[PDB]
Design a protein around this ligand. Structure first.
Ligand SMILES: CCN(CC)C(=O)c1cc(-c2cc(N(C)C3CCN(C(=O)c4ccc5c(c4)nc(C)n5-c4ccccc4)CC3)nc(NCC3(CC(=O)NC)CCCCC3)n2)ccc1F
Ligand SMILES: CCN(CC)C(=O)c1cc(-c2cc(N(C)C3CCN(C(=O)c4ccc5c(c4)nc(C)n5-c4ccccc4)CC3)nc(NCC3(CC(=O)NC)CCCCC3)n2)ccc1F
Ligand SMILES: [Ca+2]
Ligand SMILES: [Ca+2]
Ligand SMILES: [Ca+2]
Ligand SMILES: [Ca+2]
Ligand SMILES: [Ca+2]
Ligand SMILES: [Ca+2]
Ligand SMILES: [Ca+2]
Ligand SMILES: [Ca+2]
Ligand SMILES: [Ca+2]
Ligand SMILES: [Ca+2]
Lengths: 602, 602
């Protein structure tokens, strides 16, 4: 920051100097008529250079030296410590005529040096460091830097109809733990010279994305910037001082909002009461509002929201106790984080947040329900790494006039960025959800997961062996022989295997999977009036994954032995990998990724 | 592209194979009840591998070999040249039971290999190369790649009320020179197997950004994709074939449109007449729509739009013959480019294009007029390079309730990206334009330019020397002595010098300038009723820059000699750098940067 401060003909000019800047001072155009030359004195804590045509040249406090007055001869003025009274530090310039060794005129510059810094935790360790030089940027990765801000979308105070960020008030110091800290640090004399004030400010646009709070009597809570407050004039305190503000996020990254926001402080010179002039200094900090993050099946379960055997299966973990209403995610900053639940178009408590997106022109379908919303385990895809996974959403083809999740949920999910969503084809299903045909399961040593796919061809292959084994009479009276000889039903399932393979191909491509990673599970569909699939027997892939325990729907199909040839087959596949199958809607809150989302690389 | 193609129990499956992909074929789940093992034959141009648990293993066309039937035993099928009749190439699989050395059943795969490529000039040399592997991306810089598309914002046909891109019709082959070429290249037998078609398509959203044209009888011009045409079914021609399409841009990069657009081709399998199934293949090309670019003063003039001495000054260049209505820019692709004029809220000819942006809710001010719109010479700013310069726009401070150029022109200018706009402070001026206080001028050997700034302090410094020289009577009867002793007027100009220095500081910072690069020109302002500045004498910095000839307003102030102490002073500064001053609204169309905008680096 090089800033212009001209000397004024015959006058003494008072200026405030902010440490970290330097002044360029025109001496020439202040010089009286007929001067040929100037000297200068300057005080201890002012560094002064004289500068002709690039050629810098420092000067002592006391020298009697003269130079030749030219427009190419200017000064550069620095100061290296704040002032303890106003003025005191100074630079004075003498102008001497052709001979005359007494100055004809003089011009001065009376400086008060102050330090002003607007500080945040840009290095992301939870401590608000002193003027991080990257605080005005935001970059990704471990070596990256820039401060993070949560949406205050929980509720500290239960009497309250809405989430904290919904008002412009704070009713509890518990709240401030959800907020990011920003400290205005100043260092100067005991009052500002006349006609200066310090003003925090934000843009009209950011004014619905942030709220800033001052803690008075640290106690009362003052809303200074935010909704309908774009600026706040700050009381300067002298000497070394710190003001503490608390910043809350109000909106998630979304269509038309990247999640970056700015807060500024200006030292504004005035010409009067009102008549503001120009900022003589500005400092800026950036916050990135932290995205909403979903949790996959490979992540350890903490609590299962659910009659009888759901409870009994969960006693083998240390979990507590519709899938279509709710998706559990979280939000995380270096300081704080907490579960936040997305709501399909009120567990709203302390440290349990809430988002919805309601359509406006558009209307909801079955594809909006959050069984149509899943996320992979972490993956690498041609080198790019997805440490938090990829969100998966069932769709229809774009020209097919079929169904689609609302744009407003879709844009929301895209806007979060860190789980780079992938669209699948679920609209061949009557309900239309990705959870009807695919699931992930961890392999309990690793680090490594499996994709489970429904497969009609595996089902026909299984039955043709059973009919061969003579279990064709194994059972409105449904036997294998009965199904196998149903030609019409066979066609439908060839068409459904086609839909399943389309998705198989997307999933492999976008999650970097191979056939090694995929288990096909036998499954069978009947075509409804719309030509869409609905399950024929209980849909086994549509399970609960409580670690290594799998809560798999009970098939009850054409059976043999004292159990079933489907429960034997599915047990045969999963159990030899580590996984304990229990055969029996639910919805499991999980442990966050230990992986911090801000370390993610572009 | 790995794609799924299952064998079908007992059946022969016909498939189309697109070169560049590979198939994964499940053999297991097709195998009859009781098989233990399979062999396979395959034709010459089919490459087949057998794959157990990762372990690939190629197989000959004729071998009698058996393998053990398992779900982990699949095939991988490739083909390396197109087919000349349908089927012909094939893979057949034999299934043998426990002993029996004659196959019990068999399943086949009858492949027709075709080549389909949607091709563009992604390497940016004007020739449409064969399947550039980066054609589906767009990257910046010299080593960067991705195809470029002009907005067709000129007019080939003058009877027409609007610019070409405004309809969905082409009335002249001249037009196609403004368009980008895209070639669907196919290679296959003489007909497609039954139930396949090729479909070009675009998104609803891109459908108002692109128009695509087919030249029939190469002649008639067919609109295939664009406004209200999202898809086009293409006639396959057999053998080695090329279809040529022409693509026109319709909209400039803008708020909410990055300037990237996509066009796709799918091979779509059908189950019937209608009943489309799934794309078995998709190829995608990306275009970046080329931005609108402004031209600075250091660039050579081609024609001056203007009573008497404007004409006489221009005869010293080889130029042809309000500044507030119009800004000359251009647009450039590797193939084509042409001047386009931005219109403040009809030189619309062949190779002379047009854009406007009209506000909607907002209304115009003086700051909308394009004297409030300039651009620097190329600059480097802390390493970042601005090879085309930076657009400069006069503004007011954000909290000041002052004037501002319309958001819609501002967003438009930002959206173009390559001249990263900078806002200045012009609202202290009655009119409010950047051209009232600053100009650039080339230094005629280089490569190097100067910033000229209006300066009230230089003016007072000049007069104080004239009054000293006793020219205080040099001249409603205005003399130097008269001005100097006007105290009220002195104050106003101290305040205006303050506004000028604010801008000086922005300009230095954002154009990486130093005092070395700046000439202050003497200037004087009177404060109007709104406290805003209007010039006192003719505003000299507000000049025409026709190379080394400067067309400088004639000052006519307090004079001496047979001319003026202001025309002597300004001549004294400029002429010793190379520049021929002529003292005398205009608007000069210039030579584009030789620098291609796509080579610019992020
Ligand atoms: C170019 C690819 N692309 C861009 C990425 C797409 O967006 C895309 C679009 C479609 C699609 C499907 C569709 N339809 C009507 C579906 C058929 C399958 N669906 C069924 O309802 C269905 C499913 C199975 C059945 C049954 C109907 N009837 C029978 C008898 N079966 C059956 C099948 C097997 C066994 C037993 C029964 C669901 C809707 N209609 C249209 N129309 C758009 C079109 C113009 C047009 O024709 N408009 C009326 C024609 C296709 C060309 C683009 C222009 N597109 C399909 C795949 C796609 F990739
Ligand atoms: C914090 C910095 N910032 C964020 C980046 C800004 O956007 C910013 C805002 C202003 C600004 C100017 C302004 N005004 C009224 C201008 C005074 C200069 N202008 C004149 O019209 C003008 C100029 C010269 C004159 C004369 C009036 N009257 C006289 C006598 N002179 C004069 C001066 C020298 C010689 C002779 C005459 C033009 C408008 N009014 C308000 N109001 C906003 C505010 C609330 C408020 O007071 N609202 C009513 C107060 C400032 C604090 C933020 C809240 N802001 C100025 C600089 C800024 F950088
Ligand atoms: Ca820190
Ligand atoms: Ca609140
Ligand atoms: Ca809270
Ligand atoms: Ca909380
Ligand atoms: Ca879900
Ligand atoms: Ca090329
Ligand atoms: Ca047209
Ligand atoms: Ca044209
Ligand atoms: Ca043209
Ligand atoms: Ca202009």
């Amino acid at each position: 920051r090089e800033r212009t401060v001209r000397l004024q003909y015959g006058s003494r000019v008072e200026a405030v100097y902010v440490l970290g800047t330097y002044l360029w001072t025109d001496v020439y155009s202040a010089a009286p008529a007929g001067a040929q030359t100037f000297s200068l004195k300057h005080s201890e804590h002012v560094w002064v250079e004289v500068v002709r045509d690039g050629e810098a040249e420092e000067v002592a406090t006391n020298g009697k030296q003269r130079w030749l007055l030219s427009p190419s001869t200017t000064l550069r003025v620095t100061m290296s410590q704040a002032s303890t009274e106003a003025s005191s530090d100074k630079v004075t310039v003498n102008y001497y005529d052709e001979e005359g060794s007494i100055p004809i005129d003089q011009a001065g510059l009376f400086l008060t040096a102050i330090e002003i810094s607007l500080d945040v935790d840009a290095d992301r360790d939870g401590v608000v460091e002193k003027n991080n030089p990257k605080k005005a940027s935001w970059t990704w990765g471990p070596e990256g830097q820039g401060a993070i801000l949560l949406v205050n979308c929980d509720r500290e105070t239960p009497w309250l109809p809405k989430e904290d960020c919904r008002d412009e008030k704070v009713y509890s110091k518990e709240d401030l733990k959800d907020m990011s800290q920003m400290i205005l640090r100043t260092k100067g004399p005991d009052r500002l010279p006349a006609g200066y004030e310090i003003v925090l400010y934000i843009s009209m646009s950011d004014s619905d994305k942030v709220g800033v709070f001052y803690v008075e009597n640290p106690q009362r809570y003052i809303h200074i910037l935010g909704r309908r407050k774009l600026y706040h004039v700050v009381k300067y305190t002298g000497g070394s001082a710190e003001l503490l503000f608390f910043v809350e996020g109000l909106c998630f990254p979304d269509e038309g909002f990247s999640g970056l926001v700015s807060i500024h402080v200006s030292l504004l010179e005035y010409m009067a009461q009102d008549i503001p002039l120009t900022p003589i200094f500005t400092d800026t900090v950036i916050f990135r509002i932290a995205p909403w993050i979903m949790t996959p099946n490979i992540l350890p379960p903490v609590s299962v929201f659910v009659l009888k055997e759901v409870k009994n299966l969960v006693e083998k973990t240390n979990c507590e106790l519709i899938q279509d209403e709710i998706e559990f995610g979280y939000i995380e900053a270096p300081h704080k984080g907490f579960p936040v639940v997305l709501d399909s178009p009120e567990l709203l408590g302390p440290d349990f947040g809430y988002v919805t997106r309601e359509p406006l022109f558009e209307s909801v379908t079955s594809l909006d329900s959050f069984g149509n919303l899943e996320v992979s385990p972490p993956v690498t895809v041609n080198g790019k790494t997805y440490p938090l996974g990829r969100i998966l959403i069932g769709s229809s083809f774009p020209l097919s006039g079929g169904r689609r999740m609302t744009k407003v949920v879709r844009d929301f999910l895209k806007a979060q960025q860190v789980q780079a969503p992938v669209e699948l084809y679920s609209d061949w299903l009557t309900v239309g959800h990705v959870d009807e045909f695919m699931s992930f399961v961890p392999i309990p040593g690793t680090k490594k997961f499996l994709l489970l796919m429904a497969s009609t061809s595996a089902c026909y292959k299984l039955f043709r062996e059973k009919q061969k084994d003579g279990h064709g009479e194994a059972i409105k009276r449904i036997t294998i022989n009965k199904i196998l000889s149903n030609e019409s039903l066979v066609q439908e399932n060839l068409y459904f295997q086609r839909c399943l393979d389309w998705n198989r191909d997307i999933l492999k491509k976008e999650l970097g999977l191979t056939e090694q990673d995929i288990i096909d599970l036998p499954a069978l569909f009947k075509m409804d009036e719309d030509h869409r699939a609905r399950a024929f027997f209980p849909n086994m892939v549509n399970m609960i994954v409580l670690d290594k325990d799998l809560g798999i729907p009970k098939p009850f199909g054409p059976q043999v032995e004292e159990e079933c040839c489907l429960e034997m087959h599915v047990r045969g596949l999963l159990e030899p990998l580590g996984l304990e199958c229990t055969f029996i809607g639910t919805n499991v809150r999980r442990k966050p990724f230990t992986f911090k989302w801000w370390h993610m690389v572009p």
